[PDB]
Amino acid sequence: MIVTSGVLVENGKVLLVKHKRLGVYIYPGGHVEHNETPIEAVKREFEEETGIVVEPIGFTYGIIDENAVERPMPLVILEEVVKYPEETHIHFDLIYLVKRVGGDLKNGEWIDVREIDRIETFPNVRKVVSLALSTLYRLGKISKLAAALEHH
Amino acid sequence: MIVTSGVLVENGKVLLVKHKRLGVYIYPGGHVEHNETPIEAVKREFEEETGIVVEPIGFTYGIIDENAVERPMPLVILEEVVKYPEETHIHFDLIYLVKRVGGDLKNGEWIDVREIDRIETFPNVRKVVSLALSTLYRLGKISKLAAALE
Numbered sequence: 001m002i003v004t005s006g007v008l009v010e011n012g013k014v015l016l017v018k019h020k021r022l023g024v025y026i027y028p029g030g031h032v033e034h035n036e037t038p039i040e041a042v043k044r045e046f047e048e049e050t051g052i053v054v055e056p057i058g059f060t061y062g063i064i065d066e067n068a069v070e071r072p073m074p075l076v077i078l079e080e081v082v083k084y085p086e087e088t089h090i091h092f093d094l095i096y097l098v099k100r101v102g103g104d105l106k107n108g109e110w111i112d113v114r115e116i117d118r119i120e121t122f123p124n125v126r127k128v129v130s131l132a133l134s135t136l137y138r139l140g141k142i143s144k145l146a147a148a149l150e151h152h
Numbered sequence: 153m154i155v156t157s158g159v160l161v162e163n164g165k166v167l168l169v170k171h172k173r174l175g176v177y178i179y180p181g182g183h184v185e186h187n188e189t190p191i192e193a194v195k196r197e198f199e200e201e202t203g204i205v206v207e208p209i210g211f212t213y214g215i216i217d218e219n220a221v222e223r224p225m226p227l228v229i230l231e232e233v234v235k236y237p238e239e240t241h242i243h244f245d246l247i248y249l250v251k252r253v254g255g256d257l258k259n260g261e262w263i264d265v266r267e268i269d270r271i272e273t274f275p276n277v278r279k280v281v282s283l284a285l286s287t288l289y290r291l292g293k294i295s296k297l298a299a300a301l302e
């Protein structure tokens with residue numbers, strides 16, 4: 001099934017929640033409901049699971065008109081196999097980098113990335129967080145450059 | 153609804169099919185069923201609609217372990233409007249660049265990319281082929297001149 005997740009990193013910490021069934025730490029996310037887009041789903045899941053409101057970001061060519069609007073590219077797409085003694089689940093996970101735009105922390109834990117190698121996370125979470133840090137670094141260089149140009 | 157499409161470009165031509173209700177040319181594709189992945193749906197749809205067997209390609213960091221395998225990034229993701237008299241639909245379209253791996257043409261038409269204006273096409277078919285050409289050029293699959301349009 002198609003699912004989606006959101007990666008929120010602020011001041012060297014990533015917001016993770018305990019997996020509903022496995023307990024291990026994972027980025028907030030869940031199944032995309034029947035008539036919702038993955039974009040709407042990640043926003044909904046993130047706020048229901050943590051109380052924080054986010055907006056998915058990601059590369060876009062900027063296409064927008066009366067016929068279609070482009071949505072941001074996920075940070076990475078992983079096709080995950082989750083085995084349970086009862087059944088195996090296949091999750092096609094659109095993992096988005098997200099930014100905080102409101103809300104307040106009600107559930108979840110801000111995990112210092114320097115400690116993540118001694119915290120039990122769902123598979124591949126650390127590699128994905130590392131991809132987010134690199135991406136955020138480049139986004140910051142672009143943002144700082146935009147600001148420096150505003151001085152003209 | 154989530155749908156997917158496949159963009160196959162060979163020798164400066166792109167493979168398009170006629171949408172059953174709109175009657176305009178579109179990239180082969182269709183709805184992603186709740187039981188299959190977008191990758192499996194685009195392969196299934198492309199083969200059912202054209203007879204050609206394809207494999208989605210695109211950028212990947214190459215992550216793979218006992219627990220997950222990374223899938224290629226779509227060429228572009230467009231939330232498209234489809235208006236039928238009875239209802240306006242919004243399709244969240246994962247558009248994949250694909251490559252041929254087998255099969256044989258049974259339906260559809262190879263359209264010259266510099267001639268897409270000559271036929272009636274679903275909106276943004278042209279903009280998307282331009283992205284596909286630029287991506288194939290970046291991949292070193294085609295030359296810059298072959299990827300230039302307009």
Ligand code: NI
Binds near residue numbers: 021082089
């Ligand atoms: Ni589950």
Ligand code: NI
């Ligand atoms: Ni339809």
